[PDB]
mmCIF file of N, CA and C in Angstrom:
data_model
loop_
_atom_site.group_PDB
_atom_site.id
_atom_site.type_symbol
_atom_site.label_atom_id
_atom_site.label_comp_id
_atom_site.label_asym_id
_atom_site.label_seq_id
_atom_site.Cartn_x
_atom_site.Cartn_y
_atom_site.Cartn_z
ATOM 1 N N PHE T 1 36.295 36.623 -7.097
ATOM 2 C CA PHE T 1 34.939 36.412 -7.894
ATOM 3 C C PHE T 1 33.642 37.082 -6.838
ATOM 4 N N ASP T 2 33.023 37.583 -7.499
ATOM 5 C CA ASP T 2 31.596 38.043 -6.983
ATOM 6 C C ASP T 2 30.390 37.785 -7.880
ATOM 7 N N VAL T 3 30.867 37.664 -9.264
ATOM 8 C CA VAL T 3 29.867 37.944 -10.432
ATOM 9 C C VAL T 3 30.404 37.527 -11.584
ATOM 10 N N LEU T 4 29.818 36.992 -12.501
ATOM 11 C CA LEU T 4 29.955 36.405 -13.868
ATOM 12 C C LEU T 4 28.967 37.324 -14.778
ATOM 13 N N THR T 5 29.802 37.502 -15.973
ATOM 14 C CA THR T 5 29.231 38.193 -17.297
ATOM 15 C C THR T 5 29.365 37.170 -18.253
ATOM 16 N N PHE T 6 29.636 35.693 -18.335
ATOM 17 C CA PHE T 6 30.007 34.624 -19.407
ATOM 18 C C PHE T 6 29.451 34.894 -20.770
ATOM 19 N N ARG T 7 30.158 35.353 -21.821
ATOM 20 C CA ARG T 7 29.701 34.875 -22.966
ATOM 21 C C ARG T 7 30.213 33.503 -23.639
ATOM 22 N N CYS T 8 29.240 32.641 -23.459
ATOM 23 C CA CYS T 8 29.360 31.464 -23.654
ATOM 24 C C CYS T 8 28.856 30.498 -24.991
ATOM 25 N N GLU T 9 29.001 29.486 -25.358
ATOM 26 C CA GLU T 9 28.484 28.723 -26.428
ATOM 27 C C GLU T 9 28.671 27.270 -26.347
ATOM 28 N N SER T 10 27.629 26.365 -26.778
ATOM 29 C CA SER T 10 27.314 25.232 -26.636
ATOM 30 C C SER T 10 26.972 24.514 -27.714
ATOM 31 N N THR T 11 26.865 23.152 -27.579
ATOM 32 C CA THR T 11 26.471 22.291 -28.844
ATOM 33 C C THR T 11 25.911 21.063 -28.163
ATOM 34 N N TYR T 12 24.706 20.970 -28.937
ATOM 35 C CA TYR T 12 23.806 19.934 -28.149
ATOM 36 C C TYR T 12 23.540 18.737 -29.336
ATOM 37 N N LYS T 13 23.298 17.538 -29.039
ATOM 38 C CA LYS T 13 23.176 16.184 -29.856
ATOM 39 C C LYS T 13 22.105 15.670 -29.249
ATOM 40 N N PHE T 14 20.817 15.666 -29.867
ATOM 41 C CA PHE T 14 19.763 14.842 -29.335
ATOM 42 C C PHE T 14 19.844 13.273 -29.733
ATOM 43 N N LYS T 15 19.414 12.461 -28.884
ATOM 44 C CA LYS T 15 19.047 10.884 -29.042
ATOM 45 C C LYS T 15 17.588 10.811 -29.083
ATOM 46 N N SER T 16 16.924 11.562 -28.500
ATOM 47 C CA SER T 16 15.343 11.458 -28.190
ATOM 48 C C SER T 16 14.669 13.014 -28.394
ATOM 49 N N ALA T 17 13.652 13.158 -28.111
ATOM 50 C CA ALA T 17 12.642 14.429 -27.895
ATOM 51 C C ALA T 17 13.453 15.371 -27.246
ATOM 52 N N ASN T 18 13.654 15.157 -26.075
ATOM 53 C CA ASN T 18 14.139 16.024 -24.979
ATOM 54 C C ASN T 18 15.694 15.610 -24.455
ATOM 55 N N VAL T 19 15.926 14.434 -24.438
ATOM 56 C CA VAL T 19 17.274 13.848 -23.781
ATOM 57 C C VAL T 19 18.387 14.275 -24.800
ATOM 58 N N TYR T 20 19.781 14.910 -24.234
ATOM 59 C CA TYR T 20 20.501 15.187 -25.343
ATOM 60 C C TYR T 20 21.215 13.718 -25.220
ATOM 61 N N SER T 21 22.052 13.424 -26.494
ATOM 62 C CA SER T 21 23.064 12.416 -26.365
ATOM 63 C C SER T 21 24.278 12.631 -25.864
ATOM 64 N N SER T 22 24.829 14.102 -26.017
ATOM 65 C CA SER T 22 25.914 14.714 -25.555
ATOM 66 C C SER T 22 25.831 16.102 -25.223
ATOM 67 N N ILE T 23 26.734 16.641 -24.898
ATOM 68 C CA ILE T 23 26.769 18.111 -24.745
ATOM 69 C C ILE T 23 28.233 18.495 -24.917
ATOM 70 N N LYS T 24 28.288 19.747 -25.595
ATOM 71 C CA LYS T 24 29.795 20.298 -25.484
ATOM 72 C C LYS T 24 29.517 21.699 -25.304
ATOM 73 N N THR T 25 30.562 22.382 -24.433
ATOM 74 C CA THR T 25 30.400 23.801 -24.101
ATOM 75 C C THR T 25 31.890 24.248 -23.954
ATOM 76 N N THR T 26 32.114 25.464 -24.548
ATOM 77 C CA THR T 26 33.381 25.979 -24.481
ATOM 78 C C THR T 26 33.567 27.337 -23.855
ATOM 79 N N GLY T 27 32.760 28.220 -24.375
ATOM 80 C CA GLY T 27 32.377 29.532 -23.856
ATOM 81 C C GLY T 27 33.716 30.409 -23.571
ATOM 82 N N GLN T 28 33.417 31.362 -22.499
ATOM 83 C CA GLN T 28 34.465 32.313 -22.166
ATOM 84 C C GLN T 28 34.022 32.783 -20.709
ATOM 85 N N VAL T 29 34.935 33.270 -19.943
ATOM 86 C CA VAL T 29 34.977 33.806 -18.543
ATOM 87 C C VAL T 29 35.113 35.177 -18.604
ATOM 88 N N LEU T 30 34.333 35.819 -17.723
ATOM 89 C CA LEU T 30 34.123 37.513 -17.653
ATOM 90 C C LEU T 30 33.822 37.796 -15.948
ATOM 91 N N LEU T 31 34.362 39.179 -15.846
ATOM 92 C CA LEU T 31 34.130 39.559 -14.568
ATOM 93 C C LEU T 31 34.961 41.089 -14.494
ATOM 94 N N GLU T 32 34.442 41.894 -13.638
ATOM 95 C CA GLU T 32 35.068 43.264 -13.390
ATOM 96 C C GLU T 32 36.544 43.201 -13.241
ATOM 97 N N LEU T 33 37.322 44.392 -13.855
ATOM 98 C CA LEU T 33 38.874 44.406 -13.859
ATOM 99 C C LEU T 33 39.032 45.885 -13.013
ATOM 100 N N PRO T 34 40.035 45.794 -12.342
ATOM 101 C CA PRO T 34 40.415 47.077 -11.609
ATOM 102 C C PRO T 34 39.642 48.205 -11.616
ATOM 103 N N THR T 35 40.343 49.194 -12.214
ATOM 104 C CA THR T 35 39.786 50.686 -12.288
ATOM 105 C C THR T 35 39.041 50.850 -13.366
ATOM 106 N N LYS T 36 38.064 50.185 -13.744
ATOM 107 C CA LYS T 36 37.341 50.254 -15.026
ATOM 108 C C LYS T 36 38.127 50.179 -16.127
ATOM 109 N N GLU T 37 39.232 49.279 -16.074
ATOM 110 C CA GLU T 37 40.041 49.184 -17.149
ATOM 111 C C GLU T 37 40.390 47.864 -17.431
ATOM 112 N N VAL T 38 39.366 47.336 -18.384
ATOM 113 C CA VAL T 38 39.279 45.618 -18.552
ATOM 114 C C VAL T 38 39.986 45.342 -19.942
ATOM 115 N N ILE T 39 40.552 43.984 -19.607
ATOM 116 C CA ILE T 39 41.396 43.433 -20.617
ATOM 117 C C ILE T 39 41.145 42.076 -20.809
ATOM 118 N N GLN T 40 42.074 41.275 -21.463
ATOM 119 C CA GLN T 40 41.719 40.049 -21.890
ATOM 120 C C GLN T 40 41.011 38.867 -20.992
ATOM 121 N N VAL T 41 40.640 37.674 -21.246
ATOM 122 C CA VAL T 41 39.946 37.057 -20.160
ATOM 123 C C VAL T 41 40.149 35.674 -20.798
ATOM 124 N N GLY T 42 39.683 34.459 -20.146
ATOM 125 C CA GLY T 42 39.809 33.013 -20.484
ATOM 126 C C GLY T 42 38.451 32.446 -20.638
ATOM 127 N N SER T 43 38.631 31.128 -20.779
ATOM 128 C CA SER T 43 37.368 30.385 -21.021
ATOM 129 C C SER T 43 37.206 29.334 -20.162
ATOM 130 N N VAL T 44 36.253 28.308 -20.655
ATOM 131 C CA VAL T 44 35.727 27.156 -20.013
ATOM 132 C C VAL T 44 35.496 25.979 -20.693
ATOM 133 N N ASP T 45 35.360 24.938 -20.163
ATOM 134 C CA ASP T 45 35.024 23.513 -20.960
ATOM 135 C C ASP T 45 34.185 22.558 -20.195
ATOM 136 N N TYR T 46 33.500 21.997 -21.227
ATOM 137 C CA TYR T 46 32.562 20.938 -20.530
ATOM 138 C C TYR T 46 32.192 19.874 -21.532
ATOM 139 N N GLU T 47 31.776 18.437 -21.164
ATOM 140 C CA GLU T 47 31.444 17.456 -21.796
ATOM 141 C C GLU T 47 30.152 16.681 -21.022
ATOM 142 N N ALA T 48 29.629 15.868 -21.568
ATOM 143 C CA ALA T 48 28.404 15.389 -20.827
ATOM 144 C C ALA T 48 28.246 14.051 -22.052
ATOM 145 N N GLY T 49 26.956 13.358 -21.323
ATOM 146 C CA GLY T 49 26.450 12.421 -22.096
ATOM 147 C C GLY T 49 24.875 11.915 -21.710
ATOM 148 N N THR T 50 24.040 11.568 -22.379
ATOM 149 C CA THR T 50 22.734 11.122 -21.930
ATOM 150 C C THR T 50 22.161 11.925 -20.782
ATOM 151 N N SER T 51 21.930 13.409 -21.320
ATOM 152 C CA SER T 51 21.810 14.700 -20.237
ATOM 153 C C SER T 51 20.340 14.910 -20.648
ATOM 154 N N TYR T 52 19.400 15.683 -19.479
ATOM 155 C CA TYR T 52 18.177 16.437 -19.592
ATOM 156 C C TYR T 52 18.282 17.867 -19.796
ATOM 157 N N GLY T 53 19.701 18.377 -19.820
ATOM 158 C CA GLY T 53 19.978 19.812 -19.449
ATOM 159 C C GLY T 53 21.337 19.963 -19.637
ATOM 160 N N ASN T 54 21.879 21.452 -19.900
ATOM 161 C CA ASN T 54 23.090 21.640 -19.753
ATOM 162 C C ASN T 54 23.272 22.311 -18.644
ATOM 163 N N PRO T 55 24.216 21.952 -17.676
ATOM 164 C CA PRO T 55 24.510 22.314 -16.275
ATOM 165 C C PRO T 55 25.171 23.825 -16.491
ATOM 166 N N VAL T 56 25.923 24.229 -17.427
ATOM 167 C CA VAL T 56 26.729 25.700 -17.602
ATOM 168 C C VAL T 56 25.801 26.802 -18.044
ATOM 169 N N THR T 57 24.808 26.427 -18.875
ATOM 170 C CA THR T 57 23.963 27.633 -19.348
ATOM 171 C C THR T 57 22.591 27.500 -18.137
ATOM 172 N N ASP T 58 22.247 26.411 -17.553
ATOM 173 C CA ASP T 58 21.211 26.621 -16.519
ATOM 174 C C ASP T 58 21.652 27.118 -15.479
ATOM 175 N N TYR T 59 23.189 26.832 -14.880
ATOM 176 C CA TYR T 59 23.537 27.605 -13.943
ATOM 177 C C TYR T 59 23.816 29.219 -14.132
ATOM 178 N N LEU T 60 24.347 29.390 -15.105
ATOM 179 C CA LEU T 60 24.459 30.884 -15.523
ATOM 180 C C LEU T 60 23.004 31.508 -15.295
ATOM 181 N N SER T 61 21.930 31.152 -16.312
ATOM 182 C CA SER T 61 20.499 31.869 -16.045
ATOM 183 C C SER T 61 20.140 31.672 -14.749
ATOM 184 N N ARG T 62 20.179 30.553 -14.122
ATOM 185 C CA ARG T 62 19.582 30.354 -12.440
ATOM 186 C C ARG T 62 20.041 31.184 -11.598
ATOM 187 N N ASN T 63 21.141 31.665 -11.472
ATOM 188 C CA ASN T 63 21.775 32.629 -10.647
ATOM 189 C C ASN T 63 21.015 34.274 -11.354
ATOM 190 N N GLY T 64 20.729 34.327 -12.701
ATOM 191 C CA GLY T 64 20.319 35.364 -13.126
ATOM 192 C C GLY T 64 20.057 35.517 -14.424
ATOM 193 N N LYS T 65 19.419 36.459 -14.917
ATOM 194 C CA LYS T 65 19.185 36.831 -16.555
ATOM 195 C C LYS T 65 20.597 37.526 -17.071
ATOM 196 N N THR T 66 20.709 37.549 -18.386
ATOM 197 C CA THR T 66 21.722 37.873 -19.112
ATOM 198 C C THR T 66 22.187 39.358 -19.056
ATOM 199 N N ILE T 67 23.036 39.950 -19.597
ATOM 200 C CA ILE T 67 23.093 41.365 -19.522
ATOM 201 C C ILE T 67 21.838 41.922 -20.429
ATOM 202 N N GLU T 68 20.715 42.342 -19.726
ATOM 203 C CA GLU T 68 19.377 42.673 -20.127
ATOM 204 C C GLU T 68 19.298 44.173 -20.203
ATOM 205 N N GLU T 69 19.436 44.595 -21.385
ATOM 206 C CA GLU T 69 19.392 46.088 -21.728
ATOM 207 C C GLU T 69 18.088 46.218 -22.085
ATOM 208 N N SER T 70 16.857 45.412 -21.688
ATOM 209 C CA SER T 70 15.648 45.332 -21.967
ATOM 210 C C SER T 70 14.745 45.054 -20.573
ATOM 211 N N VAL T 71 14.139 46.149 -20.063
ATOM 212 C CA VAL T 71 13.172 46.109 -18.824
ATOM 213 C C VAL T 71 11.856 46.530 -19.708
ATOM 214 N N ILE T 72 10.619 45.519 -19.632
ATOM 215 C CA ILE T 72 9.477 46.225 -20.091
ATOM 216 C C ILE T 72 8.865 47.066 -19.504
ATOM 217 N N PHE T 73 8.284 48.141 -20.108
ATOM 218 C CA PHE T 73 7.605 49.277 -19.525
ATOM 219 C C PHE T 73 6.293 49.006 -18.939
ATOM 220 N N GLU T 74 5.771 49.553 -17.996
ATOM 221 C CA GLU T 74 4.759 49.146 -17.123
ATOM 222 C C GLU T 74 3.597 48.851 -17.768
ATOM 223 N N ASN T 75 2.919 49.855 -18.750
ATOM 224 C CA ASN T 75 1.582 49.513 -19.211
ATOM 225 C C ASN T 75 1.568 50.109 -20.811
ATOM 226 N N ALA T 76 0.822 49.422 -21.379
ATOM 227 C CA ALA T 76 0.767 49.674 -22.839
ATOM 228 C C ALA T 76 -0.144 50.690 -23.298
ATOM 229 N N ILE T 77 0.204 51.724 -24.290
ATOM 230 C CA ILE T 77 -0.203 52.477 -24.808
ATOM 231 C C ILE T 77 -0.111 52.676 -26.607
ATOM 232 N N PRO T 78 -0.946 53.176 -27.238
ATOM 233 C CA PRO T 78 -1.014 52.910 -28.837
ATOM 234 C C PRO T 78 0.201 53.800 -29.380
ATOM 235 N N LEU T 79 0.803 53.376 -30.351
ATOM 236 C CA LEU T 79 1.718 53.928 -31.368
ATOM 237 C C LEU T 79 1.352 54.648 -32.441
ATOM 238 N N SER T 80 0.629 53.842 -33.505
ATOM 239 C CA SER T 80 0.155 54.093 -34.615
ATOM 240 C C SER T 80 -1.065 53.526 -34.983
ATOM 241 N N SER T 81 -1.908 53.005 -33.768
ATOM 242 C CA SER T 81 -2.830 52.410 -34.137
ATOM 243 C C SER T 81 -4.064 52.944 -34.925
ATOM 244 N N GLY T 82 -4.708 52.204 -35.835
ATOM 245 C CA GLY T 82 -5.730 52.412 -36.680
ATOM 246 C C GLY T 82 -6.076 51.935 -37.900
ATOM 247 N N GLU T 83 -6.429 52.373 -38.821
ATOM 248 C CA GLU T 83 -6.490 51.959 -40.213
ATOM 249 C C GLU T 83 -5.605 52.697 -40.981
ATOM 250 N N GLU T 84 -4.796 53.384 -40.584
ATOM 251 C CA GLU T 84 -3.630 54.042 -41.085
ATOM 252 C C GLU T 84 -2.517 53.412 -40.966
ATOM 253 N N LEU T 85 -2.306 52.039 -40.436
ATOM 254 C CA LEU T 85 -1.275 51.222 -40.472
ATOM 255 C C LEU T 85 -1.631 49.733 -41.179
ATOM 256 N N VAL K 1 20.909 17.544 -14.969
ATOM 257 C CA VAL K 1 21.439 16.807 -15.742
ATOM 258 C C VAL K 1 20.870 15.315 -16.097
ATOM 259 N N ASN K 2 20.632 14.745 -14.765
ATOM 260 C CA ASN K 2 19.899 13.741 -14.838
ATOM 261 C C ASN K 2 18.219 13.487 -15.004
ATOM 262 N N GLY K 3 17.902 14.672 -14.862
ATOM 263 C CA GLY K 3 16.517 14.895 -14.895
ATOM 264 C C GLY K 3 15.682 14.445 -14.080
ATOM 265 N N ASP K 4 14.313 14.782 -14.033
ATOM 266 C CA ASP K 4 13.395 14.479 -12.870
ATOM 267 C C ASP K 4 12.812 12.959 -13.021
ATOM 268 N N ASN K 5 13.131 12.359 -13.913
ATOM 269 C CA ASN K 5 12.604 10.831 -14.140
ATOM 270 C C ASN K 5 13.486 9.873 -13.259
ATOM 271 N N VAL K 6 14.572 9.865 -13.388
ATOM 272 C CA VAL K 6 15.737 9.134 -12.905
ATOM 273 C C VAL K 6 15.957 8.987 -11.533
ATOM 274 N N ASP K 7 15.829 10.669 -11.061
ATOM 275 C CA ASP K 7 16.157 10.727 -9.609
ATOM 276 C C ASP K 7 15.086 10.260 -8.635
ATOM 277 N N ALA K 8 13.710 10.073 -9.371
ATOM 278 C CA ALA K 8 12.789 9.793 -8.539
ATOM 279 C C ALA K 8 12.896 8.043 -7.955
ATOM 280 N N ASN K 9 13.670 7.612 -8.653
ATOM 281 C CA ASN K 9 13.689 5.941 -8.478
ATOM 282 C C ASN K 9 14.921 5.632 -7.340
ATOM 283 N N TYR K 10 15.634 6.926 -7.129
ATOM 284 C CA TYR K 10 16.641 6.688 -5.981
ATOM 285 C C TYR K 10 15.927 6.678 -4.638
ATOM 286 N N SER K 11 14.767 7.205 -4.365
ATOM 287 C CA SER K 11 14.019 6.634 -3.178
ATOM 288 C C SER K 11 13.515 5.605 -2.994
ATOM 289 N N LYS K 12 13.307 4.821 -2.180
ATOM 290 C CA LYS K 12 12.535 3.631 -1.724
ATOM 291 C C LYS K 12 11.147 3.937 -1.341
ATOM 292 N N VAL K 13 10.236 2.877 -1.832
ATOM 293 C CA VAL K 13 8.876 3.466 -1.027
ATOM 294 C C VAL K 13 8.675 2.361 0.046
ATOM 295 N N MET K 14 8.231 2.951 1.343
ATOM 296 C CA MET K 14 7.984 2.300 2.339
ATOM 297 C C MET K 14 6.792 1.753 2.475
ATOM 298 N N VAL K 15 6.590 0.814 3.611
ATOM 299 C CA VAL K 15 5.443 0.073 3.622
ATOM 300 C C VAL K 15 4.605 0.641 4.703
ATOM 301 N N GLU K 16 3.194 1.154 4.211
ATOM 302 C CA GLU K 16 2.361 1.744 5.121
ATOM 303 C C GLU K 16 1.957 0.887 6.074
ATOM 304 N N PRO K 17 2.143 1.027 7.561
ATOM 305 C CA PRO K 17 1.700 0.046 8.284
ATOM 306 C C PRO K 17 0.349 0.090 8.778
ATOM 307 N N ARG K 18 -0.364 -1.104 8.935
ATOM 308 C CA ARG K 18 -1.829 -1.017 9.387
ATOM 309 C C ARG K 18 -2.154 -2.030 10.625
ATOM 310 N N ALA K 19 -3.077 -2.103 11.213
ATOM 311 C CA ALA K 19 -3.293 -3.069 12.473
ATOM 312 C C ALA K 19 -3.530 -4.283 11.930
ATOM 313 N N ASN K 20 -3.430 -5.290 12.703
ATOM 314 C CA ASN K 20 -3.287 -6.770 12.597
ATOM 315 C C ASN K 20 -4.066 -7.338 13.726
ATOM 316 N N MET K 21 -5.327 -6.847 14.141
ATOM 317 C CA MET K 21 -6.109 -7.110 15.213
ATOM 318 C C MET K 21 -6.251 -8.615 15.091
ATOM 319 N N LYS K 22 -5.817 -9.435 15.977
ATOM 320 C CA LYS K 22 -6.017 -10.902 16.265
ATOM 321 C C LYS K 22 -6.909 -11.031 17.348
ATOM 322 N N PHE K 23 -7.549 -12.665 17.588
ATOM 323 C CA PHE K 23 -8.012 -12.500 18.765
ATOM 324 C C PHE K 23 -7.060 -13.141 20.020
ATOM 325 N N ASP K 24 -6.039 -13.967 19.573
ATOM 326 C CA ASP K 24 -4.932 -14.302 20.404
ATOM 327 C C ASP K 24 -5.517 -15.124 21.623
ATOM 328 N N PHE K 25 -6.028 -16.045 21.326
ATOM 329 C CA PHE K 25 -6.239 -17.113 22.759
ATOM 330 C C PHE K 25 -4.998 -17.210 23.296
ATOM 331 N N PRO K 26 -4.891 -17.518 24.463
ATOM 332 C CA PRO K 26 -3.750 -17.952 25.292
ATOM 333 C C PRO K 26 -3.069 -18.792 24.752
ATOM 334 N N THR K 27 -1.536 -18.524 24.321
ATOM 335 C CA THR K 27 -0.551 -18.831 23.586
ATOM 336 C C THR K 27 -0.255 -20.552 24.412
ATOM 337 N N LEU K 28 -0.733 -21.385 23.615
ATOM 338 C CA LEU K 28 -0.498 -22.901 24.332
ATOM 339 C C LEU K 28 1.064 -23.191 24.097
ATOM 340 N N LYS K 29 1.763 -23.669 25.307
ATOM 341 C CA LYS K 29 2.902 -24.197 24.994
ATOM 342 C C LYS K 29 2.753 -25.734 24.844
ATOM 343 N N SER K 30 3.938 -26.201 24.351
ATOM 344 C CA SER K 30 3.942 -27.707 23.957
ATOM 345 C C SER K 30 3.923 -28.482 25.503
ATOM 346 N N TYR K 31 3.229 -29.727 25.246
ATOM 347 C CA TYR K 31 3.119 -30.698 26.239
ATOM 348 C C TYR K 31 4.506 -30.861 27.097
ATOM 349 N N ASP K 32 5.677 -31.308 26.201
ATOM 350 C CA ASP K 32 7.074 -31.382 26.634
ATOM 351 C C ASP K 32 7.529 -30.372 27.893
ATOM 352 N N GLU K 33 7.258 -28.850 27.171
ATOM 353 C CA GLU K 33 8.033 -27.704 27.903
ATOM 354 C C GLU K 33 6.812 -27.598 28.973
ATOM 355 N N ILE K 34 5.712 -27.861 29.039
ATOM 356 C CA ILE K 34 4.598 -27.616 30.068
ATOM 357 C C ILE K 34 4.491 -28.607 31.094
ATOM 358 N N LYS K 35 5.055 -29.786 30.867
ATOM 359 C CA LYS K 35 5.630 -31.131 31.769
ATOM 360 C C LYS K 35 7.015 -30.703 32.457
ATOM 361 N N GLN K 36 7.643 -29.765 32.072
ATOM 362 C CA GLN K 36 8.859 -28.976 32.610
ATOM 363 C C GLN K 36 8.606 -28.095 33.786
ATOM 364 N N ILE K 37 7.403 -26.952 33.299
ATOM 365 C CA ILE K 37 6.707 -26.086 34.192
ATOM 366 C C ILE K 37 6.461 -26.589 35.477
ATOM 367 N N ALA K 38 5.765 -27.667 35.431
ATOM 368 C CA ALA K 38 5.016 -28.328 36.425
ATOM 369 C C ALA K 38 5.775 -29.654 36.865
ATOM 370 N N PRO K 39 6.120 -30.265 37.745
ATOM 371 C CA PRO K 39 6.637 -31.706 38.001
ATOM 372 C C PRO K 39 5.547 -32.689 37.694
ATOM 373 N N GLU K 40 5.694 -33.896 38.099
ATOM 374 C CA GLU K 40 4.813 -35.090 37.712
ATOM 375 C C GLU K 40 3.306 -34.885 38.510
ATOM 376 N N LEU K 41 2.565 -33.564 37.975
ATOM 377 C CA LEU K 41 1.226 -33.499 38.714
ATOM 378 C C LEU K 41 0.300 -34.062 37.746
ATOM 379 N N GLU K 42 0.728 -35.227 36.972
ATOM 380 C CA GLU K 42 -0.465 -35.531 35.765
ATOM 381 C C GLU K 42 -1.228 -36.413 36.429
ATOM 382 N N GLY K 43 -2.713 -36.430 35.659
ATOM 383 C CA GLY K 43 -3.659 -37.232 36.195
ATOM 384 C C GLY K 43 -4.027 -37.393 37.632
ATOM 385 N N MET K 44 -3.866 -36.131 38.215
ATOM 386 C CA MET K 44 -4.259 -36.293 39.914
ATOM 387 C C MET K 44 -5.286 -35.413 40.344
ATOM 388 N N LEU K 45 -5.568 -34.346 39.482
ATOM 389 C CA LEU K 45 -6.851 -33.427 39.745
ATOM 390 C C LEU K 45 -8.131 -33.982 39.059
ATOM 391 N N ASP K 46 -8.982 -33.864 39.730
ATOM 392 C CA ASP K 46 -10.237 -33.902 38.705
ATOM 393 C C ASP K 46 -10.718 -32.791 38.014
ATOM 394 N N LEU K 47 -10.814 -32.969 36.858
ATOM 395 C CA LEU K 47 -11.076 -32.068 35.671
ATOM 396 C C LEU K 47 -12.303 -31.574 35.890
ATOM 397 N N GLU K 48 -13.193 -32.392 36.416
ATOM 398 C CA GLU K 48 -14.720 -31.961 36.570
ATOM 399 C C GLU K 48 -14.729 -30.863 37.692
#
């Protein structure tokens, strides 16, 4: 292990405005394989109760952002701006 | 998980100490114990 790229999925249950009655997480596990030849992987599991956040998702985010094929360009210029839009 | 509102109660609030300036006249011992410090010297000096 040196890095993750989990494709996960969770399930929240609210008991109030922000606090969650329960948490359910099952997700999937990811990491690089041998000579760029990747095959099947496994998954995860989690439950909770009366929680103010999800450990799994917050952990994955806190270590870093997702597979982000979107880095914003430095400065803005117009594209088709004017009255012809 | 537990949020920032519950973990704050885990720590106790201490007492912020301050001065207790008294005047503290010399501590008068009891008569029974001060008759032990000095033997029967009672009524023998002129207090004046």
